[PDB]
Design a protein around this nucleic acid. Structure first.
Lengths: 82, 71, 93, 85, 75, 75, 69
RNA sequence: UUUUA
């Protein structure tokens, strides 16, 4: 199962996004596209040093700013089953 | 295209090229392409304020170009 | 695909890849693709103690985009045929 | 776009650029390339070394934002700096 | 008539190359492409570190084009 | 309001350009292309770390690093 | 291609210096990677410690290298 | 908008 297919299957589920500068965004994945652009809801934004935190109701992240994404193992299992 | 009109009118004239690194090149603009690759004649290289090199002809890869300015 | 073909002529020979992160890896070139991704086998890392996480790796893939250099021993046939091929591309394309 | 920017029309949004610049402004227009027109823009200035926000702002007025250098967009309403969750 | 002609006319000549990361190369140009990927023969690299310079030599050296800033043909 | 229509309405007027780095330009907008590479005339360039400024009579600015374009120029 | 590494344990080195060790499950034409049962291994000289991390999707441009373990 | 910025 391709990486972006899993990403599409993660819509509606919690995700962690780390940006190239080390900022992290914890939220529910609302939408994504083939650029890996993302929209998230109910977001916690952590600054690189881990020193300042923000709550955002939603946000949009341009795909070419992404370092990596983390998703629950349960998600990969349930998506593989379906 | 205004960018192309400007470039067409400084071809064969002395220009200042600033790279994103801030290194400067002063030279005679010979020609350019669609990637903003440049060929200069009579090129002087400047770092901070000091002249560090000269080249009779220099090729500059376009991705590093911050601007081309008339002199 | 001039340099793709060049590297396909170096498969099963020893090369050293210097990465943009300044690590150098020597090994046998086993694979190369259109992007100049490479696969190396029986690798040895230069200044290996500086890169302890590499100690148990024998085979690896390197993304072409992170390469600064690939260097190798010279051969006359290699050099004149490569120059020939570049001039051939220029005359044809 | 997966983001329907018309939902933010006449709302204050926060925009972050590649390289670290951060602004807020009221969305007045946009195009399919995610260029924006924002009004009443304020830029949150950063410290030269650490690159962290200093708390000071500068007012920029009516601004065209380039979609190519945009990395983050989020509405201001409902946002807040919070302690470690 | 186009900038890459400067590189074309430098085939089999000793060129100077300025690269990102405070590096310079001098070597015989054996091949290049539109990315400015190139192969230099009998090449010397000067790495400047901040003041100090380290010199290295390569019998045959492939250079990925995205590091290239400037190429100068020989005088 | 369409962003590029606002820029086109600024032609012949002052425009203030803020780069992603600590660098800014202010001058008269001559024109721009589909990638928003911009030609400015009677320009002032600002290094906003050192505070040094430089003048240029006319220049083509690469649009790659541009973050903001502010019609009406710099205060 | 990377198909030879699928379902094998690998170390992935990222541009920011992070070391991820996990099971490669998939990849695409950008070398985007999907890893399962991943740990992040933090080194200080020859010493290290591990953090359980779960599933990653690594965006290909951040991948320096992938090594079979 | 990821392997030629």
């Amino acid at each position: 199962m391709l990486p972006l297919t899993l990403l599409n299957a993660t819509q509606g589920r919690p995700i962690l996004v780390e940006l190239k500068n080390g900022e992290t965004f914890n939220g529910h994945l609302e939408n994504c596209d083939n650029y890996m652009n993302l929209t998230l809801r109910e977001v916690i934004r952590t600054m690189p040093d881990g020193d300042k935190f923000f709550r955002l109701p939603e946000c949009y992240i341009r795909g070419n700013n992404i370092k990596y994404l983390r998703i629950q193992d349960e998600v990969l299992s349930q998506v593989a089953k379906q | 295209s205004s960018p192309n009109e400007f470039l067409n009118k400084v071809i064969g004239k002395k220009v200042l090229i600033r790279l994103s690194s801030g290194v400067d090149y002063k030279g005679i603009l010979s020609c350019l392409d669609g990637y903003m690759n440049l060929a200069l004649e009579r090129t002087e290289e400047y770092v901070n304020g000091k002249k560090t090199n000269v080249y009779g002809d220099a090729f500059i890869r376009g991705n590093n170009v911050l601007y081309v300015s008339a002199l | 695909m001039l340099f793709y073909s060049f590297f396909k002529t170096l498969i099963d020979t020893e090369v050293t890849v210097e990465l943009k992160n300044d690590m150098s890896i020597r090994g046998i070139l086993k694979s190369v693709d259109q992007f100049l991704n490479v696969k190396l086998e029986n690798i040895s890392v230069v200044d290996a103690s500086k890169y302890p996480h590499m100690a148990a790796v024998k085979d690896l893939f390197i993304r072409g985009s992170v390469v600064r250099y690939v260097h190798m021993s010279s051969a006359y046939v290699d050099t004149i045929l490569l120059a020939d091929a570049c001039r051939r591309d220029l005359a044809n394309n | 776009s997966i983001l329907d920017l018309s939902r933010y029309q006449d709302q204050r949004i926060q925009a972050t650029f590649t390289g670290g610049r951060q602004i807020t402004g009221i969305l007045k227009g946009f195009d399919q390339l995610m260029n924006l027109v924002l009004d009443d823009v304020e830029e949150q200035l950063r410290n030269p070394e650490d690159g962290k926000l200093t708390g000071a702002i500068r007012k920029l007025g009516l601004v065209v934002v380039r979609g190519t250098t945009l990395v983050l967009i989020a509405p201001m309403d409902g946002s807040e700096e919070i302690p470690n969750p | 008539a186009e900038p890459l002609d400067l590189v074309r006319l430098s085939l089999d000549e000793i060129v100077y190359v300025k690269l990102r990361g405070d590096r310079e190369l001098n070597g015989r140009l054996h091949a290049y492409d539109e990315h400015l990927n190139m192969v230099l023969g009998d090449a010397e690299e000067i790495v400047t570190i901040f003041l100090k310079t380290i010199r290295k030599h390569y019998e045959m050296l492939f250079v990925r084009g995205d590091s290239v800033i400037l190429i100068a043909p020989p005088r | 309001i369409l962003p590029l229509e606002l820029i086109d309405k600024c032609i012949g007027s002052n425009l203030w350009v803020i780069m992603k780095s600590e660098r800014e330009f202010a001058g008269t907008l001559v024109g721009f292309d589909d990638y928003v590479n911009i030609v400015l005339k009677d320009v002032t360039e600002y290094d906003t770390v050192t505070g040094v400024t430089e003048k240029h009579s006319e220049m083509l600015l690469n649009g790659n690093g541009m973050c903001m374009l502010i019609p009406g120029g710099k205060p | 291609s990377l198909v030879d590494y699928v379902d094998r344990k690998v170390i992935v080195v990222l541009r920011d210096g992070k070391k991820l060790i996990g099971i490669l499950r998939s990849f695409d034409q950008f070398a985007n990677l999907m890893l399962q049962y991943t740990i992040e291994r933090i080194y200080v000289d020859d010493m290290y410690g591990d953090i359980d991390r779960g599933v990653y999707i690594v965006r290909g441009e951040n991948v320096v290298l992938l090594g079979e373990l």
